[PDB]
Design an enzyme around this catalytic site. Structure first.
Site, mmCIF file in Angstrom:
data_model
loop_
_atom_site.group_PDB
_atom_site.id
_atom_site.type_symbol
_atom_site.label_atom_id
_atom_site.label_comp_id
_atom_site.label_asym_id
_atom_site.label_seq_id
_atom_site.Cartn_x
_atom_site.Cartn_y
_atom_site.Cartn_z
ATOM 1 N N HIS A 103 0.857 -1.172 0.000
ATOM 2 C CA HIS A 103 0.000 0.000 0.000
ATOM 3 C C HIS A 103 0.895 1.225 0.000
ATOM 4 O O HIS A 103 2.103 1.101 0.101
ATOM 5 C CB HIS A 103 -0.941 0.007 1.172
ATOM 6 C CG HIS A 103 -0.227 0.030 2.484
ATOM 7 N ND1 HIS A 103 0.179 -1.112 3.121
ATOM 8 C CD2 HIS A 103 0.232 1.067 3.205
ATOM 9 C CE1 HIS A 103 0.878 -0.762 4.201
ATOM 10 N NE2 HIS A 103 0.922 0.559 4.280
ATOM 11 N N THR A 153 2.348 1.517 11.408
ATOM 12 C CA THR A 153 2.179 2.962 11.441
ATOM 13 C C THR A 153 0.704 3.316 11.462
ATOM 14 O O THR A 153 0.386 4.508 11.532
ATOM 15 C CB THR A 153 2.824 3.685 10.243
ATOM 16 O OG1 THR A 153 2.093 3.320 9.070
ATOM 17 C CG2 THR A 153 4.271 3.425 10.142
HETATM 18 N N1 FMH Z 1 1.669 1.149 7.392
HETATM 19 S S1 FMH Z 1 2.261 -0.319 7.842
HETATM 20 O O1 FMH Z 1 3.026 -0.892 6.734
HETATM 21 O O2 FMH Z 1 3.060 -0.171 9.051
HETATM 22 C C1 FMH Z 1 1.013 -1.407 8.194
HETATM 23 C C2 FMH Z 1 0.850 -2.716 7.662
HETATM 24 C C3 FMH Z 1 -0.198 -3.588 8.000
HETATM 25 C C4 FMH Z 1 -1.226 -3.165 8.877
HETATM 26 C C5 FMH Z 1 -2.393 -4.070 9.253
HETATM 27 N N2 FMH Z 1 -2.732 -5.161 8.523
HETATM 28 C C6 FMH Z 1 -3.818 -5.780 9.076
HETATM 29 C C7 FMH Z 1 -4.280 -5.123 10.212
HETATM 30 C C8 FMH Z 1 -5.472 -5.467 11.115
HETATM 31 CL CL1 FMH Z 1 -7.041 -5.600 10.197
HETATM 32 SE SE1 FMH Z 1 -3.405 -3.755 10.587
HETATM 33 C C9 FMH Z 1 -1.112 -1.856 9.368
HETATM 34 C C10 FMH Z 1 -0.029 -1.028 9.058
HETATM 35 ZN ZN ZN Z 2 1.939 1.723 5.565
#
Ligand code: FMH
Ligand code: ZN
Length: 257
Positions: A91, A195
């Site tokens: 993403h 994050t």
């Molecule tokens: N922005 S980041 O790459 O640190 C990142 C990656 C993955 C998630 C989540 N994936 C499933 C989640 C519970 Cl539905 Se939260 C949240 C944040």
């Molecule tokens: Zn992210």
């Protein structure tokens, strides 16, 4: 109910998720002069030849390009990592203007956007178990600047009209995430967190030094997405980034001199 608005944005998250004020929160500012070269870091291995993308989803906070992670097909290894981490989704985070959008910063510089390729440690069996462990995830972070178009991004940009609003998804097969990688795999690395809520302290961050260039038209298309669901008041999906968090008792290591 957490989000990125005035009443539910990052300064409010601690009330539902107290770990927001924890000891290894992300993102952070990368001070390039204080990061130390670590000659013992092994080279990074990004093995995406057999990657199987499935679907693209607007989840109300970003869009995720989701991968089949039921076998070892798209894996990250090496670098600071022990073992094998499997790609689950990527993403982006981006701004309302080209001057902001990234989550990590480099000597306080904000990029226009930041790509996150999210991987989980196969020794924990699945993503949900992995996020409960301090070494559960490895996130590859790549900065985006506005300039020349990134040809390998256009297939993503062109499907966004079909997932404008929260909860929409669309089939998204045969997308090759190799087309989103800069030339150099030189990186910084530190221990941190998700994050977004739940802000779990489960991530080895690997942030590449070399940004990719995307066109103004490409990023403008990200800014037409909506945080809201269909038939709700339109709120553009922009500025979906958490600002830099205190470094606390951590060292950022560099893979390069
Ligand atoms: N922005 S980041 O790459 O640190 C990142 C990656 C993955 C998630 C989540 N994936 C499933 C989640 C519970 Cl539905 Se939260 C949240 C944040
Ligand atoms: Zn992210």
């Amino acid at each position: 109910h957490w989000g990125y608005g005035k009443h539910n944005g990052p300064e409010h998250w601690h009330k539902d998720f107290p770990i927001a004020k924890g000891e290894r929160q992300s993102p952070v500012d990368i001070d390039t002069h204080t990061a130390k070269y670590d000659p013992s870091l092994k080279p990074l291995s990004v093995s995406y030849d057999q990657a199987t993308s499935l679907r693209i989803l607007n989840n109300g906070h970003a869009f995720n390009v989701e991968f089949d992670d039921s076998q070892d097909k798209a894996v990250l290894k090496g670098g600071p990592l022990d073992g094998t981490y499997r790609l689950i989704q990527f993403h982006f985070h981006w701004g309302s203007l080209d001057g902001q959008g990234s989550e990590h910063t480099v000597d306080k510089k904000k990029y226009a956007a930041e790509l996150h390729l999210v991987h989980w440690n196969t020794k924990y069996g699945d993503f949900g178990k992995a996020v409960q462990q301090p070494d559960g995830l490895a996130v590859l972070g790549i900065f985006l600047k506005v300039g020349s178009a990134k040809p390998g991004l256009q297939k993503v940009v062109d499907v966004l009209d079909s997932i404008k609003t929260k909860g929409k998804s669309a089939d998204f097969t045969n997308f090759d995430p190799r087309g989103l990688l800069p030339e150099s795999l030189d990186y910084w690395t530190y221990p941190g967190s998700l994050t977004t809520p739940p802000l779990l302290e489960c991530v080895t961050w690997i942030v590449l030094k070399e940004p990719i260039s995307v066109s103004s038209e490409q990023v403008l298309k990200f800014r037409k997405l909506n945080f809201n669901g269909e038939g709700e008041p339109e709120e553009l999906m922009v500025d979906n980034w958490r600002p830099a968090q205190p470094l606390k008792n951590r060292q950022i290591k560099a893979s390069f001199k």
